Design a protein around this nucleic acid. Structure first.
Ligand SMILES: [Mg+2]
Ligand SMILES: [Mg+2]
Ligand SMILES: [Mg+2]
Ligand SMILES: [Mg+2]
Ligand SMILES: [Mg+2]
Ligand SMILES: [Mg+2]
Ligand SMILES: [Mg+2]
Ligand SMILES: [Mg+2]
Ligand SMILES: [Mg+2]
Ligand SMILES: [Mg+2]
Ligand SMILES: [Mg+2]
Ligand SMILES: [Mg+2]
Ligand SMILES: [Mg+2]
Ligand SMILES: [Mg+2]
Ligand SMILES: [Mg+2]
Ligand SMILES: [Mg+2]
Ligand SMILES: [Mg+2]
Ligand SMILES: [Mg+2]
Ligand SMILES: [Mg+2]
Ligand SMILES: [Mg+2]
Ligand SMILES: [Mg+2]
Ligand SMILES: [Mg+2]
Ligand SMILES: [Mg+2]
Ligand SMILES: [Mg+2]
Ligand SMILES: [Mg+2]
Ligand SMILES: [Mg+2]
Ligand SMILES: [Mg+2]
Ligand SMILES: [Mg+2]
Ligand SMILES: [Mg+2]
Ligand SMILES: [Mg+2]
Ligand SMILES: [Mg+2]
Ligand SMILES: [Mg+2]
Ligand SMILES: [Mg+2]
Ligand SMILES: [Mg+2]
Ligand SMILES: [Mg+2]
Ligand SMILES: [Mg+2]
Ligand SMILES: [Mg+2]
Ligand SMILES: [Mg+2]
Ligand SMILES: [Mg+2]
Ligand SMILES: [Mg+2]
Ligand SMILES: [Mg+2]
Ligand SMILES: [Mg+2]
Ligand SMILES: [Mg+2]
Ligand SMILES: [Mg+2]
Ligand SMILES: [Mg+2]
Ligand SMILES: [Mg+2]
Ligand SMILES: [Mg+2]
Ligand SMILES: [Mg+2]
Ligand SMILES: [Mg+2]
Ligand SMILES: [Mg+2]
Ligand SMILES: [Mg+2]
Ligand SMILES: [Mg+2]
Ligand SMILES: [Mg+2]
Ligand SMILES: [Mg+2]
Ligand SMILES: [Mg+2]
Ligand SMILES: [Mg+2]
Ligand SMILES: [Mg+2]
Ligand SMILES: [Mg+2]
Ligand SMILES: [Mg+2]
Ligand SMILES: [Mg+2]
Ligand SMILES: [Mg+2]
Ligand SMILES: [Mg+2]
Ligand SMILES: [Mg+2]
Ligand SMILES: [Mg+2]
Ligand SMILES: [Mg+2]
Ligand SMILES: [Mg+2]
Ligand SMILES: [Mg+2]
Ligand SMILES: [Mg+2]
Ligand SMILES: [Mg+2]
Ligand SMILES: [Mg+2]
Ligand SMILES: [Mg+2]
Ligand SMILES: [Mg+2]
Ligand SMILES: [Mg+2]
Ligand SMILES: [Mg+2]
Ligand SMILES: [Mg+2]
Ligand SMILES: [Mg+2]
Ligand SMILES: [Mg+2]
Ligand SMILES: [Mg+2]
Ligand SMILES: [Mg+2]
Ligand SMILES: [Mg+2]
Ligand SMILES: [Mg+2]
Ligand SMILES: [Mg+2]
Ligand SMILES: [Mg+2]
Ligand SMILES: [Mg+2]
Ligand SMILES: [Mg+2]
Ligand SMILES: [Mg+2]
Ligand SMILES: [Mg+2]
Ligand SMILES: [Mg+2]
Ligand SMILES: [Mg+2]
Ligand SMILES: [Mg+2]
Ligand SMILES: [Mg+2]
Ligand SMILES: [Mg+2]
Ligand SMILES: [Mg+2]
Ligand SMILES: [Mg+2]
Ligand SMILES: [Mg+2]
Ligand SMILES: [Mg+2]
Ligand SMILES: [Mg+2]
Ligand SMILES: [Mg+2]
Ligand SMILES: [Mg+2]
Lengths: 146, 49, 63, 100
RNA sequence: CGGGGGGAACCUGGGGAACUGAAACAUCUCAGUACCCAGAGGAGAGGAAAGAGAAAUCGACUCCCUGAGUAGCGGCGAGCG
RNA sequence: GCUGUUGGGAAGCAGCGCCAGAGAGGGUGAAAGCCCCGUAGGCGAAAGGUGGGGGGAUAGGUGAGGGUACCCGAGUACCCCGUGGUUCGUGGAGCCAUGGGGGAAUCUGGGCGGACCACCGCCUAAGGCUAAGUACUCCGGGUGACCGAUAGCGCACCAGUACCGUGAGGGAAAGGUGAAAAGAACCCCGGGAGGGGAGUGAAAUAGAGCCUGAAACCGUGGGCUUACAAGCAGUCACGGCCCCGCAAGGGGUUGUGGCGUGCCUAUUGAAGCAUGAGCCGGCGACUCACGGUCGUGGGCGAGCUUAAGCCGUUGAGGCGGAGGCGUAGGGAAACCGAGUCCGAACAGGGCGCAAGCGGGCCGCACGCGGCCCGCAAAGUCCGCGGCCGUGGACCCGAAACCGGG
RNA sequence: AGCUGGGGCUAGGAGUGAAAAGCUAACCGAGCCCGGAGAUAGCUGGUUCUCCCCGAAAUGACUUUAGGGUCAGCCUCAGGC
RNA sequence: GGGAUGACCCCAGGCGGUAGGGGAGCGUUCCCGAUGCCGAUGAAGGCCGACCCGCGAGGGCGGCUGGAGGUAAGGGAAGUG
RNA sequence: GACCCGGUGAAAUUGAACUGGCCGUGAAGAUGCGGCCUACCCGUGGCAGGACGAAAAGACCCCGUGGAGCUUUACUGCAGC
């Protein structure tokens, strides 16, 4: 491939819009031609302007937090055995994060649909219907964290 | 990777010289012919997948 | 610089899986003194449209 | 200081333009103009007389400067560049072959 | 023996606005910013835990990247963080 | 690295050579690796700085048991009142500082873990010092998909000057002969200026505020054409005169005829007796950064991708998984989970999920495995573009507010 | 209660004023300079090359709103039906 | 629809236009292309043209001036008309 | 003084001008449209009805959630007591 032979494909549309001249976007220059759009509007993500904006709504979100903040709580991330049936042996956390799911998101919780594979699976939790699926010869090394 | 060779070519108007661990696309394309030694064809390998 | 999450929004809307925006019905906060059970009962979240498009744009980063 | 070049009050060969070939001596080096004198590029200068003193004025006059580059030194051979030898206690400019 | 002044920015300390923003405005914002003063130097400051805060944890201070526009703050407004 | 050749001038072109750890660059009458200065590579300090990087030498530091309970930083801790700091704006308001008042103890002490109390822990306040990593750029150097004299610093020039103001302070304009001054002897008109000759030069309409030297503007000469006509000045049509070419045809001018309400702006509506512009030249306004949202060119895709920083180069790229998105949706939450939330309810209902393949090939089970495929299930990353947010955010304009003088 | 030279003092929410909001360096209902500062300006003005396809609105609701806005109506482009 | 993908052919409709949306192009500065290629038998710029190409922005070629630079195809940036 | 000669030599203004009258018409008051009327070309001294003549982005009026000075038993603060 020659040096003066690449050039982008057929869509890198450098053609950005130039404000103008007699033919195209012009004078008032594309958009405009009125007034109050000469330095930037209010939002308008919020405007609106004068009347009460859809802020007539109402904080439901009971609990937004005290002042010290968020309470150091253990978070659990589900991961359907569906995906779990991608490899074999003895799947466990870390081996799951390193895989392509979970990752540092704390405690492991297998469940979801998918057909449970005959093998041992270590987790911090298991869903009811998941524990059932491992009926077809599997495992249940729950608890952990010691 | 041989500085002695590198030193010898270099000044040739038709020669563009590089150390193996400097192999980049732009240069390969700006030249017509590519000449690597086997020890440099390796570093190249250790970089391709 | 890094756009900011509108906390006034983050406090009254839960953005759903399909992208819809959801919030609690307005009315029963103190209005009452005598409203049909039907009215006071019929208050449990709802849609919004063309307007939530706007909402979602304020909840940027927190996806 | 650094302002230095290749020639001095000695014999040189012109490789220049109008006098390519011409050979001459002491070019009374400048080098503010980085030129030399030699015996060529000598123009005719008009004269009224900078003061009656030495009345009349002619047109045959003096010798003009010449960019130091247009000339090449010579000794016990011909043109050729200059090198520098240490003389076991000095620094004299010697030519690749001859010696000065 | 020293001190005194000068020094473009940079630095620490002592004081410290307003226009603006909130589509009026006073809490809030602008901002401990602009500016004034004192001091120090090739830097200054900070610095070896009466610390962090949940981890049978870390182990001076400063500096960068993340953490995170998170946790939270807010006429729960603008916005701040 | 010489020669020849064109030329005012070679370095161009030509013939035949040469060096290269140097073919970066600049100059030399034009374009040069070998003419000049340099460049690669390699040397160099009597003197003054700097300098654990390497050596030393010092100051300084080298214990267990058991007893005692002597000492461990005071107007301090601590509590209350007034405030500041922190993400914390009175808040359930802790922590760190402290102006006021009251006011301890010495490890059987005292502070902290966000009111407070009890547990379990963490740490030793009221004395001081401490390199490095970090910040900046008056100064020196090296680079530029930085400028090229209305640009770039206000200043390329004898500029913080000239000028302005009482003062604080404001603040200009102005660069280029030629290769070489060879800067025009001398003669002629003139008081000079300025010219005409002569002379220099390749060029003098390069002759000196001199390279090039556009436009507005002012003239001289010529061609067509005008004193019974009247107009947004042009246009369409014939005709006359002049000019090109052999011709057909074309160029200039304009005598009649026909038709014709400047440009911009702003408006329901302008030739408008609404705005702006004397004319010309030059400067003059939708950008950039980081986020966001679509779209799009690619890479890889149950995944994608690194940031700082490190190693390399000195226009060479690598490494670096901290981290971020994505793979589960629900709930205010605990929490549960292809479900979940309201509910007593397997009633209902609100959010949710339920993804293959158009399909070549082929191991060559009368089985399609599964390689492959679009680019998805389905996402990510980078490039590009549109729009949005924060920034002065398209450019120019206030009356004013505040600070120090 | 005069006029006048020389030498001095008082200034920016301040001075001075036989009082007019007079005067404070040729425009004082708040001096001038430099700075915050590119204040803000929902207003006015201006917004520069060419061709091809489509082509509006001047309505409604709300608005300390009424010559400004948000959603809808009407235009355009891509994909789908 | 031809489809010999001939992007050229017949067939059929359409082609006023402000705010605006969309799609193609022209030119300017600079970078790669460049140790290349044009250039004193003359660069850039300037002054002319009744000729050539293009719908247009322009691009050519020719005469004069000018006297030392200029820079293809193909792409890339932006103080770009 | 004005007028004329020799000397010297400005200004605001200015889209360009080949710049007439009447009835009409037109964004309602046209040298510029229509119809008609009048009218050889160019100046010089005078007059001031028109060029909605010049100058000043109306000082009146309204609009802007513009600004300032001033008032009070408007609000909220502060000095001072
Ligand atoms: Mg406008
Ligand atoms: Mg309007
Ligand atoms: Mg308007
Ligand atoms: Mg503005
Ligand atoms: Mg109920
Ligand atoms: Mg996030
Ligand atoms: Mg010596
Ligand atoms: Mg000292
Ligand atoms: Mg400071
Ligand atoms: Mg301070
Ligand atoms: Mg300070
Ligand atoms: Mg304020
Ligand atoms: Mg405001
Ligand atoms: Mg703050
Ligand atoms: Mg240092
Ligand atoms: Mg230090
Ligand atoms: Mg240092
Ligand atoms: Mg200690
Ligand atoms: Mg020549
Ligand atoms: Mg030669
Ligand atoms: Mg040539
Ligand atoms: Mg050279
Ligand atoms: Mg050179
Ligand atoms: Mg040669
Ligand atoms: Mg060297
Ligand atoms: Mg020494
Ligand atoms: Mg004791
Ligand atoms: Mg506070
Ligand atoms: Mg506090
Ligand atoms: Mg106290
Ligand atoms: Mg006290
Ligand atoms: Mg304490
Ligand atoms: Mg305490
Ligand atoms: Mg405590
Ligand atoms: Mg603690
Ligand atoms: Mg606690
Ligand atoms: Mg502690
Ligand atoms: Mg201490
Ligand atoms: Mg201590
Ligand atoms: Mg210290
Ligand atoms: Mg220190
Ligand atoms: Mg630095
Ligand atoms: Mg300048
Ligand atoms: Mg110039
Ligand atoms: Mg300077
Ligand atoms: Mg200047
Ligand atoms: Mg003065
Ligand atoms: Mg001659
Ligand atoms: Mg010349
Ligand atoms: Mg020249
Ligand atoms: Mg000239
Ligand atoms: Mg002219
Ligand atoms: Mg004439
Ligand atoms: Mg007649
Ligand atoms: Mg006649
Ligand atoms: Mg006519
Ligand atoms: Mg108007
Ligand atoms: Mg209109
Ligand atoms: Mg008019
Ligand atoms: Mg007009
Ligand atoms: Mg107007
Ligand atoms: Mg206008
Ligand atoms: Mg005017
Ligand atoms: Mg102009
Ligand atoms: Mg112009
Ligand atoms: Mg972006
Ligand atoms: Mg984007
Ligand atoms: Mg359900
Ligand atoms: Mg402006
Ligand atoms: Mg003051
Ligand atoms: Mg007196
Ligand atoms: Mg004042
Ligand atoms: Mg002041
Ligand atoms: Mg008084
Ligand atoms: Mg008086
Ligand atoms: Mg007064
Ligand atoms: Mg006065
Ligand atoms: Mg005032
Ligand atoms: Mg500001
Ligand atoms: Mg301004
Ligand atoms: Mg502005
Ligand atoms: Mg607005
Ligand atoms: Mg433009
Ligand atoms: Mg149409
Ligand atoms: Mg709309
Ligand atoms: Mg479509
Ligand atoms: Mg059209
Ligand atoms: Mg348009
Ligand atoms: Mg190049
Ligand atoms: Mg020639
Ligand atoms: Mg150029
Ligand atoms: Mg521009
Ligand atoms: Mg006269
Ligand atoms: Mg009339
Ligand atoms: Mg008429
Ligand atoms: Mg007419
Ligand atoms: Mg007259
Ligand atoms: Mg008069
Ligand atoms: Mg009048």
């Amino acid at each position: 491939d020659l040096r003066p032979n690449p050039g982008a494909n057929k869509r890198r549309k450098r053609v950005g819009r130039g404000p103008g001249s007699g033919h195209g976007k012009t004078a008032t220059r594309g958009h405009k031609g009125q007034k109050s759009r000469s330095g930037g509007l209010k939002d308008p993500r919020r405007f609106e302007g004068g009347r009460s904006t859809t802020l007539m709504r109402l904080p439901k979100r009971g609990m937004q937090g005290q002042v010290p903040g968020e309470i150091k709580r253990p978070r659990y991330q589900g991961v359907n055995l569906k995906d779990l049936a991608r490899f074999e042996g003895e799947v466990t956390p870390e081996l799951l994060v390193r895989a392509g799911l979970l990752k540092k998101g704390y405690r492991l919780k297998i469940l979801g649909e998918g057909e449970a594979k005959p093998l041992k699976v270590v987790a911090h939790a298991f869903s009811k219907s998941a524990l059932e699926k491992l009926k077809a010869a599997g495992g249940e090394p729950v608890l952990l964290e010691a | 990777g041989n500085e002695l060779v590198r030193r010898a070519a270099r000044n040739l108007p038709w020669v563009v010289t590089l150390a193996p661990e400097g192999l980049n696309v732009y240069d390969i394309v700006r030249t017509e012919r590519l000449v690597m030694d086997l020890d440099a064809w390796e570093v190249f390998q250790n970089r391709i997948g | 610089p890094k756009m900011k999450t509108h906390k006034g929004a983050k406090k009254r809307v839960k953005i759903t899986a399909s992208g819809k925006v959801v919030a609690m019905k307005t009315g029963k906060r103190h209005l009452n003194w005598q409203k049909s059970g039907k009215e006071i009962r019929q208050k449990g979240r709802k849609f919004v449209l063309a307007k939530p498009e706007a909402e979602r744009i304020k909840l940027l980063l927190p996806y | 200081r650094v302002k230095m070049h290749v020639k001095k009050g000695d014999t040189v060969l012109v490789a220049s333009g109008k006098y390519k070939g011409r050979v001459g001596k002491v070019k009374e080096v400048l080098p503010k103009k980085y030129a030399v004198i030699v015996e060529g590029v000598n123009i005719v200068k008009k004269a009224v007389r900078v003061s009656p003193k030495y009345p009349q004025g002619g047109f045959i006059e003096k010798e003009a400067p010449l960019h130091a580059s247009k000339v090449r030194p010579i000794c016990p051979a011909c043109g050729k560049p200059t090198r520098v030898r240490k003389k076991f206690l000095e620094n004299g400019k010697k030519i690749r072959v001859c010696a000065k």
